[PDB]
Structure 1
Amino acid sequence: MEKKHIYLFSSAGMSTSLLVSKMRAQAEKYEVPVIIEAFPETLAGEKGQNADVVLLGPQIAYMLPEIQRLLPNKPVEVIDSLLYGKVDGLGVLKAAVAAIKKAAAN
């Protein structure tokens, strides 16, 4: 192991793709041990799996009840839509973390 996978499942497209690629900035502007990938919410079933923490578009939000069957455990989290389409992969590094702590609960 020695690194994990911050995965993103897209609302419109390009309020994410560069937010991963900045969130990436983050990771190697540090050393944070995680790949950030973002898909066309088509993969998240399979990629969701291959991830350690997950994300999905604000606007395709609807899929999360689904996404949560496919994976009824993981630290999945649909984005915010202005952090999204302002492509803030430094709140999205923090906001990931927040997810994987909103994991636990008995």
Structure 2
Amino acid sequence: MEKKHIYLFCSAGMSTSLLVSKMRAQAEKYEVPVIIEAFPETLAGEKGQNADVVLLGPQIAYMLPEIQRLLPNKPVEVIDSLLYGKVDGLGVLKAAVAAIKKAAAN
């Protein structure tokens, strides 16, 4: 079954969980076949290798150049501060899908 990988990275992996949970619940509601999981930044190399998009917490946004260095062939984007503060699952899900498409096409 065609499924895309959206992996989220922050220092510990735990505060992002609620955003992931909401993104998942809306992905279920709108029958979007995607795997959305959160991990610590240490596994950015190892797990990012199988990501279709890598999403970063605004708190580790300064590490975008360094993770870009780690994963130069994978679209690596930061989650918008306001969307994260608002915890708007759909907004972030759309941005993730949009980034996948700004890699595969467009």
Deviation string for 1:41-79 (max 9, x for gaps)? Answer: 221211111211110111211111111111102121111
CA distance in 2, matches of 1:31, 1:105: 22
More strand by share: 2
TM-score (norm 1): 0.84
**Do 1:11 and 1:56's aligned partners in 2 also have CA atoms closer than 8 Å?**
no
Q: Percent identity?
A: 99
Change (3 A) 1:6 1:76: same
TM-score (norm 2): 0.84
Change (3 A) 1:23 1:105: closer
**Do 2:12 and 2:41's aligned partners in 1 also have CA atoms closer than 8 Å?**
no
Quote the offset at 1:2 in angstroms.
1.6
CA distance in 2, matches of 1:105, 1:5: 17
Larger deviation: 59-68 or 3-12?
3-12
**Do 1:56 and 1:77's aligned partners in 2 also have CA atoms closer than 8 Å?**
yes
Larger deviation: 64-73 or 78-87?
78-87
After TM superposition, the runs of 4+ consecutive aligned structure 1 residues lying more than 4 A away are 11-15
Q: Which residue of 2 aligns with 1:26?
A: 26
More helix by share: 2
SS in 1 for 2:38: strand
Quote the offset at 1:5 in angstroms.
1.0
Change (3 A) 1:29 1:105: closer
CA distance in 2, matches of 1:24, 1:87: 13
Gaps of 5+ in 1: none
CA distance in 1, matches of 2:76, 2:100: 8
RMSD (Å), alpha carbons: 2.3
The count of aligned residue pairs is 106
Change (3 A) 1:105 1:6: closer
CA distance in 2, matches of 1:93, 1:104: 17
Larger deviation: 88-97 or 39-48?
39-48
